[PDB]
Design an enzyme around this catalytic site. Structure first.
Site, PDB file in Angstrom:
ATOM      1  N   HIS A  47       0.815  -1.216   0.000  1.00 59.88           N
ATOM      2  CA  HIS A  47       0.000   0.000   0.000  1.00 59.88           C
ATOM      3  C   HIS A  47       0.866   1.293   0.000  1.00 59.88           C
ATOM      4  O   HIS A  47       0.303   2.374  -0.058  1.00 59.88           O
ATOM      5  CB  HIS A  47      -1.080   0.014   1.093  1.00 59.88           C
ATOM      6  CG  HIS A  47      -0.571   0.140   2.491  1.00 59.88           C
ATOM      7  ND1 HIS A  47      -0.673  -0.903   3.384  1.00 59.88           N
ATOM      8  CD2 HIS A  47      -0.019   1.200   3.119  1.00 59.88           C
ATOM      9  CE1 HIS A  47      -0.152  -0.454   4.513  1.00 59.88           C
ATOM     10  NE2 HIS A  47       0.260   0.805   4.392  1.00 59.88           N
ATOM     11  N   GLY A  59       2.239   5.983   9.682  1.00 60.97           N
ATOM     12  CA  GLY A  59       3.674   6.047   9.416  1.00 60.97           C
ATOM     13  C   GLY A  59       4.433   4.831   9.930  1.00 60.97           C
ATOM     14  O   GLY A  59       5.561   4.584   9.487  1.00 60.97           O
ATOM     15  N   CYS A 109       3.617   1.645   9.416  1.00 65.52           N
ATOM     16  CA  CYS A 109       3.511   0.506   8.501  1.00 65.52           C
ATOM     17  C   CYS A 109       4.884   0.098   7.990  1.00 65.52           C
ATOM     18  O   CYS A 109       5.744   0.957   7.789  1.00 65.52           O
ATOM     19  CB  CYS A 109       2.541   0.790   7.359  1.00 65.52           C
ATOM     20  SG  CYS A 109       0.851   1.183   7.888  1.00 65.52           S
TER      21      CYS A 109
HETATM   22  N1  LIG Z   1      -2.946  -2.694   4.274  1.00 61.93           N
HETATM   23  C1  LIG Z   1      -3.533  -1.761   4.567  1.00 61.93           C
HETATM   24  C2  LIG Z   1      -4.228  -0.566   4.964  1.00 61.93           C
HETATM   25  C3  LIG Z   1      -5.604  -0.424   4.791  1.00 61.93           C
HETATM   26  N2  LIG Z   1      -6.291   0.646   5.211  1.00 61.93           N
HETATM   27  C4  LIG Z   1      -5.607   1.611   5.850  1.00 61.93           C
HETATM   28  C5  LIG Z   1      -4.233   1.548   6.100  1.00 61.93           C
HETATM   29  N3  LIG Z   1      -3.510   2.431   6.929  1.00 61.93           N
HETATM   30  C6  LIG Z   1      -3.391   2.355   8.267  1.00 61.93           C
HETATM   31  O1  LIG Z   1      -4.069   1.604   8.964  1.00 61.93           O
HETATM   32  C7  LIG Z   1      -2.340   3.270   8.864  1.00 61.93           C
HETATM   33  C8  LIG Z   1      -2.134   2.997  10.336  1.00 61.93           C
HETATM   34  C9  LIG Z   1      -2.598   3.867  11.313  1.00 61.93           C
HETATM   35  C10 LIG Z   1      -2.403   3.574  12.650  1.00 61.93           C
HETATM   36  C11 LIG Z   1      -1.733   2.408  12.972  1.00 61.93           C
HETATM   37  N4  LIG Z   1      -1.272   1.549  12.052  1.00 61.93           N
HETATM   38  C12 LIG Z   1      -1.478   1.855  10.766  1.00 61.93           C
HETATM   39  C13 LIG Z   1      -3.538   0.452   5.614  1.00 61.93           C
END
Ligand SMILES: N#Cc1cncc(NC(=O)Cc2cccnc2)c1
Ligand SMILES: N#Cc1cncc(NC(=O)Cc2cccnc2)c1
Lengths: 304, 304
Positions: B41, B143, B145
């Site tokens: 992503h 951030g 990820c």
């Molecule tokens: N694969 C995938 C995906 C799908 N939808 C949204 C996101 N983005 C987050 O969840 C960013 C985030 C925010 C807080 C903690 N951990 C991550 C990624």
């Protein structure tokens, strides 16, 4: 979101861990520049630990009696000295992995990461706090002495703790990196009891703000209180008295959430008087006091 | 003595963390040998995340569109490919700090350390468990990820998790290092609910043995039970059913303490039926399920 007891990345500290042997005793050492820091009880035999005279014991030791191993290779000891309860072993090679570092003596209530080590090798890392009775509730076995506690600001490691002993109560006592014990403990195999373990009030309040930020809001109430009224409750529950300095440091958390500090104190007061009634806060069934207001902001903002 | 939620030393993993940027999206990457692994992503814009076609999105990307920074220096991308939900960016330089490593897909109930990272830089390390509903209860912000979960056997790092998303419930979902999600989650900004969060029974039992070893014995009772009777209670309290495999793995802990597994199950049964009555076990007011029997033995013996 989510809130965890998080330790600093340990890499900068792993590169400093060495093994120090003196006679038949082996413990951990901390190699920074050309100096290896370790607990002075490395010169003791179990018989000596009952009533040791470290000045007399050190007279019978030469530079060659201190064996310092860094990973797999031997360091040459060219100097030895005693600074309070630590030995400083001057070696002929500067640690090439020495990070930017400081030696700091922390206040009770402050938190730090511990890199538990055995035979100079790291086994694990966890978050800890210097308790108001100057002990730490760590996880250490025989051989862990010389393991250090630390904090990290961007690239600078502030060493604050060196592990020396375990009290008969299963709690731990140690020194700063100048060899001064936190609290009244001595490096002697004698019964030493820790004082009252009080709860770090400003840290519980910081943790309630972290819970509000993360969605756990059930404990928020319609009440407020004063510093004097709150402290009457805090005294009754063996909580540290809250001061205007504590309120000041909770300022950024109060600003982010829009919940006045005295309002959060009233929630804490009700939680102390009524308990959690089978509920949890940040996956905990008790009030957590090992996150400082700085820890909460750091984790909730992603400071690397 | 003392028992802590302890993470593995993170040094070997810190040396693998890099920053990956694609367009305006920046996340973490894992550099091992000449390959950088990151969530796919990274090629998405917030508009794309609603319903992304990664195969079509990747067609518009070339090797030069993936910016990989290791610390302060730029890595040259000579290849790019998609493996399930991760991108493998072939770079022209092997990571000189690549430790001995494996890619393993863990089972639910198993634990691992997380090195939370932002912009390729580590912020903290904590211990986690893959829940029976295939989510993890981590601490991650936007951030984070590309942050990885791992275990360590002496010098070998077994990478088991890569963080991809946070569900609306504040729990986290991610993949193994082959890009396969744990559980039924997809890398799409669509409401995905996690299933029942059950308690990892074998881990609670392992933790009760750790408490016995450390002095907390109040919960030990005069009773015993059977696997079938225990599981009737376990089902009622949303606990995982206990099997003979679980009893087998608790064997060394049962041998060390001299408390038969079915006897410890009867203590757990009473704790489930009666609660803790305001008491604590290993400083916890609830039954801890994020220590495997392996974690307990490791910490209680000092495996480095
Ligand atoms: N694969 C995938 C995906 C799908 N939808 C949204 C996101 N983005 C987050 O969840 C960013 C985030 C925010 C807080 C903690 N951990 C991550 C990624
Ligand atoms: N200074 C000093 C000193 C005084 N008396 C005894 C010891 N030794 C230990 O406590 C070893 C130990 C055991 C478990 C956990 N942490 C440490 C040191």
């Amino acid at each position: 979101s989510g809130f965890r007891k998080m330790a600093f990345p340990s890499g900068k500290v792993e590169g400093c861990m060495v093994q120090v042997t003196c006679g038949t005793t082996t413990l951990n050492g901390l190699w920074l520049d050309d100096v290896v820091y370790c607990p002075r009880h490395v010169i003791c035999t179990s018989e000596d630990m009952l009533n040791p005279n470290y000045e007399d014991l050190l007279i019978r030791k030469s530079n060659h009696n201190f064996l310092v191993q860094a990973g797999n290779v031997q360091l040459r000891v060219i100097g030895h000295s005693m600074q309070n309860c630590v030995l400083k072993l001057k070696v002929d090679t500067a640690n090439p992995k020495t990070p930017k570092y400081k030696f700091v003596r922390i206040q009770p209530g402050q938190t730090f990461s511990v890199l538990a080590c055995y035979n100079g090798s790291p086994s694990g890392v966890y978050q800890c706090a210097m308790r108001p009775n100057f002990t730490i509730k760590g996880s250490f076995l025989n051989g862990s002495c010389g393991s250090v506690g630390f904090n990290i600001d961007y690239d600078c490691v502030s060493f604050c703790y060196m592990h020396h002993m375990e009290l008969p109560t299963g709690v731990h006592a140690g020194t700063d990196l100048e060899g001064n014990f936190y609290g009244p403990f001595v490096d002697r195999q004698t019964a030493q009891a820790a004082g009252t373990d009080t709860t770090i009030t400003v840290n519980v309040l910081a943790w309630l703000y972290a819970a509000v930020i993360n969605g756990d809001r059930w404990f928020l109430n319609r009440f407020t209180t004063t510093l004097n009224d709150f402290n009457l409750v805090a005294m009754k529950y063996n909580y540290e008295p809250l001061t205007q300095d504590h309120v000041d440091i909770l300022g950024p958390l109060s600003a982010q959430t829009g919940i006045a500090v005295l309002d959060m104190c009233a929630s804490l007061k009700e939680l102390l008087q009524n308990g959690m009634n089978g509920r949890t806060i940040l996956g905990s069934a008790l009030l957590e006091d090992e996150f400082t207001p700085f820890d909460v902001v750091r984790q909730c903002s992603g400071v690397t």
